[PDB]
Amino acid sequence: YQNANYSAFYVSEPFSESNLGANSTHDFVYYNMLRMWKGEDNSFPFNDAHDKTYNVRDGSDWEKTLKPRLHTRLDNSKNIILFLSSITANSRALREEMNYGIGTKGLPVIVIYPDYDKKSDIVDSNGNFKKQIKDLWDKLPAFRDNMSSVATLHIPCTKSVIISALNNEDFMVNTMADAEKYYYKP
């Protein structure tokens, strides 16, 4: 029960996943990457909170329809998979996913950085997060300002690394590690 992974990312709105080109549009492309890995290999450790339809950006009415949908899907989830990239920009729904999912629920977050493919892109040799990463947090204040309360894992975008993250109990709410920002050491 409540075993899903909740994918959170930016797209310019309104966005429908059924329009031609949806699967080519940043940052939806990275969510679809997870879906395709799972569809191709059932061992991939991803259970999509949005499996029935990705309709959390599609224009629906905030109060009556969209916000309740965000909350319901987050309530079915053990963690958030957040994609942060150079194009992550303002979005009411994405903000609410952070405030409710982290601030209210205390869900841990696996943060995938699709612009980067090396561990050394995330942290410097003293284990400080690089400015290029901190700058992405500033693009989503509701992530930045809630992340202190949960375990977060900050990773480059490579399949084997994503699998390792998703197989780690430390980043699942019922088994969460102590709140800190974690990373794989370069």
Determine the Cα–Cα distance for residues 4 and 79; give it in Å rounded to an integer: 7
Q: Which residue has the tokens 């309709």?
A: 55
The number of CA neighbours under 13 Å toward the Cβ of 64 is 3
Determine the Cα–Cα distance for residues 151 and 172; give it in Å rounded to an integer: 9
Do residues 112 and 79 touch, judged by C-beta distance below 8 A? Answer: no
Domain ranges of the chain: 1-186
Task: Name the architecture of domain 1-186.
Answer: 3-Layer(aba) Sandwich (3.40)
Neighbours of 20 (CB within 10 A): 6
The number of CA neighbours under 13 Å toward the Cβ of 140 is 29
Determine the Cα–Cα distance for residues 145 and 148; give it in Å rounded to an integer: 7
Question: How many helices (H) and strands (E) are present in the chain, helices listed first?
Answer: 6, 5
Report the Cα 29 to chain-centroid distance in Å: 13
CA dihedral 111, 114, 118, 123 (to 10 degrees): -40
DSSP-derived secondary structure for 154-171 = EEES-HHHHHHHHT-GGG
Resolution in A: 1.2
Do residues 10 and 46 touch, judged by C-beta distance below 8 A? Answer: no
H/E element, 144: helix 141-144
Report the Cα 126 to chain-centroid distance in Å: 26
The encoded tokens of residue 119 equal 């561990």
